[PDB]
Amino acid sequence: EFEFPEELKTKLQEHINYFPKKRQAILLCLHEIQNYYGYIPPESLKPLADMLELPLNHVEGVVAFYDMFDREDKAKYRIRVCVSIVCHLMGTNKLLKALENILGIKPGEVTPDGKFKIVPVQCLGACSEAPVFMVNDDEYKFESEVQLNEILSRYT
Amino acid sequence: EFEFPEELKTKLQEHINYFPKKRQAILLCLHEIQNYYGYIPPESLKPLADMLELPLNHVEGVVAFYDMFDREDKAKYRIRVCVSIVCHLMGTNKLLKALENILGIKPGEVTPDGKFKIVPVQCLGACSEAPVFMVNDDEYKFESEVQLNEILSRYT
Amino acid sequence: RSYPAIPRIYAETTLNMLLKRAKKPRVHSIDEYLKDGGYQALEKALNMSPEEIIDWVDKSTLRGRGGAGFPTGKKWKFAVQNPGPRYFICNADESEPGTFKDRIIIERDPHLLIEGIIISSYAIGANEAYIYIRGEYPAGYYILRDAIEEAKKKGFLGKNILGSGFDLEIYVARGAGAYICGEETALIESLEGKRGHPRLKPPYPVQKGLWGKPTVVNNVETIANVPFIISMGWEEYRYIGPSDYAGPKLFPVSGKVKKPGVYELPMNTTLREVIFKYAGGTLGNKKVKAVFSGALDCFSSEELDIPMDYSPLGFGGTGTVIVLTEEDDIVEAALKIAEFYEHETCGQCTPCRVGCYEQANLLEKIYKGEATEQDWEGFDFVNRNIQPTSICGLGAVAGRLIRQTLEKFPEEWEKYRK
Amino acid sequence: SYPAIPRIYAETTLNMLLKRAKKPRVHSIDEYLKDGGYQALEKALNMSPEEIIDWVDKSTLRGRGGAGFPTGKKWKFAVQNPGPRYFICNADESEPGTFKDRIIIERDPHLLIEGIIISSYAIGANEAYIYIRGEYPAGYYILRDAIEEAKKKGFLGKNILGSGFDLEIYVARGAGAYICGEETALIESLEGKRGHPRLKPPYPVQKGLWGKPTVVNNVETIANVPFIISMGWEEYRYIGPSDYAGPKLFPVSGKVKKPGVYELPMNTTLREVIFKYAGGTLGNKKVKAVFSGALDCFSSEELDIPMDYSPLGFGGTGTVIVLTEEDDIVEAALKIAEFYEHETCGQCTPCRVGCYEQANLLEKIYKGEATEQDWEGFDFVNRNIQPTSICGLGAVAGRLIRQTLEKFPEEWEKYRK
Ligand SMILES: Nc1ncnc2c1ncn2[C@@H]1O[C@H](COP(=O)(O)OP(=O)(O)OC[C@H]2O[C@@H](O)[C@H](O)[C@@H]2O)[C@@H](O)[C@H]1O
Ligand SMILES: Nc1ncnc2c1ncn2[C@@H]1O[C@H](COP(=O)(O)OP(=O)(O)OC[C@H]2O[C@@H](O)[C@H](O)[C@@H]2O)[C@@H](O)[C@H]1O
Numbered sequence A, B: 001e002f003e004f005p006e007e008l009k010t011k012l013q014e015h016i017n018y019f020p021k022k023r024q025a026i027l028l029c030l031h032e033i034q035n036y037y038g039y040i041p042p043e044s045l046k047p048l049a050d051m052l053e054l055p056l057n058h059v060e061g062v063v064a065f066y067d068m069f070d071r072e073d074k075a076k077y078r079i080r081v082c083v084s085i086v087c088h089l090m091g092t093n094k095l096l097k098a099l100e101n102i103l104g105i106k107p108g109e110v111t112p113d114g115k116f117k118i119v120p121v122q123c124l125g126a127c128s129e130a131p132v133f134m135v136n137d138d139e140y141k142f143e144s145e146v147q148l149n150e151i152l153s154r155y156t
Numbered sequence C: 001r002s003y004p005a006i007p008r009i010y011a012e013t014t015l016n017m018l019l020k021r022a023k024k025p026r027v028h029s030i031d032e033y034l035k036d037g038g039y040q041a042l043e044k045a046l047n048m049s050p051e052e053i054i055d056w057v058d059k060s061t062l063r064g065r066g067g068a069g070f071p072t073g074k075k076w077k078f079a080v081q082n083p084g085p086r087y088f089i090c091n092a093d094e095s096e097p098g099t100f101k102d103r104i105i106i107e108r109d110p111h112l113l114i115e116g117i118i119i120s121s122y123a124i125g126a127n128e129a130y131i132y133i134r135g136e137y138p139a140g141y142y143i144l145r146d147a148i149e150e151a152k153k154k155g156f157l158g159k160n161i162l163g164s165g166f167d168l169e170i171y172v173a174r175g176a177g178a179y180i181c182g183e184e185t186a187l188i189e190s191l192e193g194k195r196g197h198p199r200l201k202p203p204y205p206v207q208k209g210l211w212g213k214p215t216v217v218n219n220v221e222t223i224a225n226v227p228f229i230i231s232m233g234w235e236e237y238r239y240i241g242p243s244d245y246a247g248p249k250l251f252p253v254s255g256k257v258k259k260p261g262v263y264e265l266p267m268n269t270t271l272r273e274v275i276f277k278y279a280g281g282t283l284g285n286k287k288v289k290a291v292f293s294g295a296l297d298c299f300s301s302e303e304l305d306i307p308m309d310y311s312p313l314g315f316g317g318t319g320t321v322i323v324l325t326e327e328d329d330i331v332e333a334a335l336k337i338a339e340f341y342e343h344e345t346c347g348q349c350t351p352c353r354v355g356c357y358e359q360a361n362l363l364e365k366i367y368k369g370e371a372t373e374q375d376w377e378g379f380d381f382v383n384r385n386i387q388p389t390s391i392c393g394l395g396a397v398a399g400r401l402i403r404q405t406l407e408k409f410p411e412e413w414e415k416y417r418k
Numbered sequence D: 001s002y003p004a005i006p007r008i009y010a011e012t013t014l015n016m017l018l019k020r021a022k023k024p025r026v027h028s029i030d031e032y033l034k035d036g037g038y039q040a041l042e043k044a045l046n047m048s049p050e051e052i053i054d055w056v057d058k059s060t061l062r063g064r065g066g067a068g069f070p071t072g073k074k075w076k077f078a079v080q081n082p083g084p085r086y087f088i089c090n091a092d093e094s095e096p097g098t099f100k101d102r103i104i105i106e107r108d109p110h111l112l113i114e115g116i117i118i119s120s121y122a123i124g125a126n127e128a129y130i131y132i133r134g135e136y137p138a139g140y141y142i143l144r145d146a147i148e149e150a151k152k153k154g155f156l157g158k159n160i161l162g163s164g165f166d167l168e169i170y171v172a173r174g175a176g177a178y179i180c181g182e183e184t185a186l187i188e189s190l191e192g193k194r195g196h197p198r199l200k201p202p203y204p205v206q207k208g209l210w211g212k213p214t215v216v217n218n219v220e221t222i223a224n225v226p227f228i229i230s231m232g233w234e235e236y237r238y239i240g241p242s243d244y245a246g247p248k249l250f251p252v253s254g255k256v257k258k259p260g261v262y263e264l265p266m267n268t269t270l271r272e273v274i275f276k277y278a279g280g281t282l283g284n285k286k287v288k289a290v291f292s293g294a295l296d297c298f299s300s301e302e303l304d305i306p307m308d309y310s311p312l313g314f315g316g317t318g319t320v321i322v323l324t325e326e327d328d329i330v331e332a333a334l335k336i337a338e339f340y341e342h343e344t345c346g347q348c349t350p351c352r353v354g355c356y357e358q359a360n361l362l363e364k365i366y367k368g369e370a371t372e373q374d375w376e377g378f379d380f381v382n383r384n385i386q387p388t389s390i391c392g393l394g395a396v397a398g399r400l401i402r403q404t405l406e407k408f409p410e411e412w413e414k415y416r417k
């Protein structure tokens, strides 16, 4: 009953044709799915498995394993906040507070409109620019609440 | 009494045997002679005429007509620099300046050791890669003086 | 099989025909050509009559890609009305400024050209064919020589090709530095072992060419279309692009664009699309000032919406696109065009001989700010009087582009006078 | 147009790896070519693969991914095994404090690509991969585009520059697992599975991707290769101390005035990195400790060590996180514990339960909710993560924290009493 829209299916098929073996495309496909839907829909996994010529439970195990994938919460924008050592030293907690002031949510929560989810993550490899966060694929140093507010206004 | 070395005479004879009529081989023969000697020896023309069954003046007229042939300067490596519109717009003068910096010569000049001659030529049919130069049969886009120096050091 | 170094010209196709393999910058050998179904067009052609092949090529609407856009089928028909033997010549002299489309076929997919030559030769009953390739394409020369040998070994050349009773040898000749040897009659003179001196026309080569015998001269790109026409049939070919000016076309794009290279596009594409849609726009996003159609025409920025076809209002020529932007000095550019014609007049005709020379010499004085009033008036006069008594197209066009710049950019020339 | 990237500061005394990447922007192939880029590749293709291996061997180049294994020797091991062979660039860089590799990827991708092509040719690999972490989306798009540029210019594909050498580079993306930087978990991920490390030996060079000889090398390692070919191995070995030669990138973070990446020779001392290059400490506060990523903890008494791969040297990836006198070492240890808790793959029982319990108990200690048994249990767990572990994570998950317990007993005791 569940089918990928042709727009997405075409991209998935492109990833599957990219590497020498279909099953190597699994993570690129799952990223693409999460990009499209704002999460991994459980229903999506069976048709992807078919496309990868893998068993379903293989795909399910991969989704379970990799922390970037989310089957629980639909969110238009994922605000990934680094909670590792350097960002912690340099002010992760100031960033989380500013996020709570602007959006009204804490780590692990989604705004009522489904627009923003705060996701606590390990070191983002930008430690010199701590404290670090991403908004989907965009990555930034947190400077202050006024600055954060301006950045977030760009995502609509 | 000038004679071609045997190994060259063989190649000339091969060109002469290639086309249905001997006299069609004149340009291939002259290329071969220039490749071998680094120029067209005026003494070479008489025996070439004999091999082509052509008058000497016919051969002389042809050598005079075709710009690729040079009867005056011996050179191991001919650096053909394109001076036509596209290469000019994209930086012929940068390439010439670089060539002067490395080799100490300008267009039309041969180095003292007789190793390099810079030959200004019309469009080389590689305009997308302007500015273009050749070193004998090898053809290159000029990127910079550092790049050019490395290329030229391949020719010993 | 080491070949000399060739710069890796960028190539892009929306049609995947002429550049199916040549969009990749390397030699494609006969096994790769065969794996892509190459030489099946030839096999199909040899099971057809010459007459029917001519008919298909005619009905395809294929036109000359070497600059003049003459209907190819029509040209072939004229040749075969004349008694044999006949000769087929592939024109690979490609020496006009800005033009580098033919070499990418030669250097990357030589079997596409070879296959076209064999079909074309069969169509006109020629048992002897030539490739005349400019001397400054040495790699192309060696690549073609090797490809011809490959074709011989697979039985696509030689006697009684694939049991058809059709014999063909392809000889590869080299130029030695004269642009004029791309003019078909001067090419023939050069093949006959002489100076590249154009002959009075008519007769056209199809009546009297090599050794005075019926001769078809066609451009590399033209010939490269022939395998497709046979392979897909003329109907399907004519379905490519607009119905009047159908088929793929190569566009060599250089100058102030982000993505200089060769583009395989249909001929309904506009000049604006070539520059902005395909070639990535201008360097630094600067305004387009002019496009030089090789050394033939100059289009202003008001003429970007023309189709890249062979219609009266179209771009025409060989589809050569040299882009100049707002800071490029038009007088300096015109000097380079003038210099080209000075270097390349063969000198048989007096107005051409002296006109190309004086055009360059006077324009240099103007450019350097050393021109007298008489030099200025003399320049204008000479530009208008290169053509009289000329027996080939060089004399007819040596002043053409430069006149167009005088008409389209009066203010910039005035700066040099005042 | 790429996603937003913070503008990490970069400085070099050598002008090699950071010649272009000292400027925070993408350098495309034309800029790379103007600086003489890809001429080393051209030179390499005129050499035998064996010759290239010999040069890389004699350069004394060592792995820059943490373990410092000699690169040429790794290659030799691979090529003694029958092909086909694979080459993998490890761009998973996910260890706390480490951000050296990304600035090569994001600013000078062609340096990496050129390195990959030379290395692949050296070991006879016709198929190469970059495995880049999922949280580097910009780097992924930048690499894909750069690979296309390289194809356009004929540095990739079949019969590269008439050499007869064929290469394709595939870019794969991680999806959140630090363990996928361990070379065998990386390979498992490339094969489309969970990132579960394999028992070594065999090493990848004997049995890797699809069980075939596979070389895994770090980004920074690979970026050295164009220089070795270009300068020659002897000239390369003139850079820095002759036993630990070549440029090295140092990602410096924490309580310094100029946090960023520094390209320096490996005879540089830790003190020089902090005070001579990174501008000293914020507020001119005293240095308390340096965390070598999540691997080691050096005290203020250990600043005069060289930044090399010697027994008494800094080692690791040269990752320098500076803590000053007001930074609570126990709070900092907690963050390290949390990292390992979140990244154990769970295959091994002492690693699975130990990484979890170390974090769980240390949180209780930090919050003042630890019983006497929680204290003694924490100590025991910290000493017992390694047993039966099949990869280096289990081997080091307690290492840094143990060093804090030994070097900063007074602070720990404050939490006990
Ligand atoms: N009546 C005819 N009968 C037979 N063949 C003919 C006839 N008219 C033209 N042709 C052939 O058509 C082709 C083009 O002929 P021309 O119009 O004379 O063109 P040409 O002078 O060869 O080329 C001029 C071209 O070159 C460049 O300067 C510029 O692009 C210009 O369009 C040639 O092969 C020519 O023999
Ligand atoms: N005997 C060997 N034969 C062949 N290759 C070998 C051998 N020993 C090591 N190697 C190779 O050398 C590299 C380093 O191997 P290890 O010493 O096993 O280290 P590894 O587990 O990969 O990484 C540990 C590193 O990561 C961080 O936790 C920390 O920086 C630590 O130093 C790997 O590519 C490995 O395949």
Ligand SMILES: Cc1cc2nc3c(=O)[nH]c(=O)nc-3n(C[C@H](O)[C@H](O)[C@H](O)COP(=O)(O)O)c2cc1C
Binding pocket: C063, C064, C065, C066, C067, C068, C069, C070, C091, C092, C093, C094, C095, C096, C179, C180, C181, C182, C183, C184, C185, C217, C218, C219, C220, C222, C223, C392, C393, C394
């Ligand atoms: C001065 C001059 C130069 C020419 N140069 C070329 C050339 O390099 N290649 C080419 O194919 N045609 C060139 N032509 C056109 C040829 O004379 C001829 O029209 C063409 O080769 C016929 O092939 P086509 O009908 O397939 O275009 C030139 C014409 C002139 C007047």
Ligand SMILES: Cc1cc2nc3c(=O)[nH]c(=O)nc-3n(C[C@H](O)[C@H](O)[C@H](O)COP(=O)(O)O)c2cc1C
Binding pocket: D062, D063, D064, D065, D066, D067, D068, D069, D090, D091, D092, D093, D094, D095, D178, D179, D180, D181, D182, D183, D184, D216, D217, D218, D219, D221, D222, D391, D392, D393
């Ligand atoms: C848990 C763990 C994580 C690792 N992460 C990385 C990493 O992100 N990048 C890296 O290049 N090496 C990483 N390594 C080291 C690799 O396993 C391997 O030694 C290295 O990629 C080899 O390349 P090199 O010899 O050039 O350093 C990690 C090792 C372990 C144990």
Ligand code: SF4
Binding pocket: C180, C197, C198, C344, C345, C346, C347, C348, C349, C350, C352, C353, C390, C391, C392, C393, C394, C395, C396
């Ligand atoms: S018009 Fe010019 S190029 Fe043509 S034949 Fe006459 S002199 Fe030669």
Ligand code: SF4
Binding pocket: D179, D196, D197, D343, D344, D345, D346, D347, D348, D349, D351, D352, D389, D390, D391, D392, D393, D394, D395
């Ligand atoms: S030591 Fe830890 S991370 Fe490594 S394989 Fe075992 S459980 Fe996984």
Ligand code: FES
Binding pocket: A082, A083, A084, A085, A086, A087, A088, A122, A123, A124, A125, A126, A127, A130, A132, D096, D097, D098
């Ligand atoms: S600790 Fe936050 S980016 Fe590294």
Ligand code: FES
Binding pocket: B082, B083, B084, B085, B086, B087, B088, B122, B123, B124, B125, B126, B127, B130, B132, C097, C098, C099
């Ligand atoms: S103008 Fe220089 S190659 Fe064409």
Ligand SMILES: [Cl-]
Binding pocket: A020, A021, A022, A023
């Ligand atoms: Cl498969």
Ligand code: NA
Binding pocket: C047, C048, C049, C052
């Ligand atoms: Na028929």
Ligand code: NA
Binding pocket: D051
């Ligand atoms: Na050697």
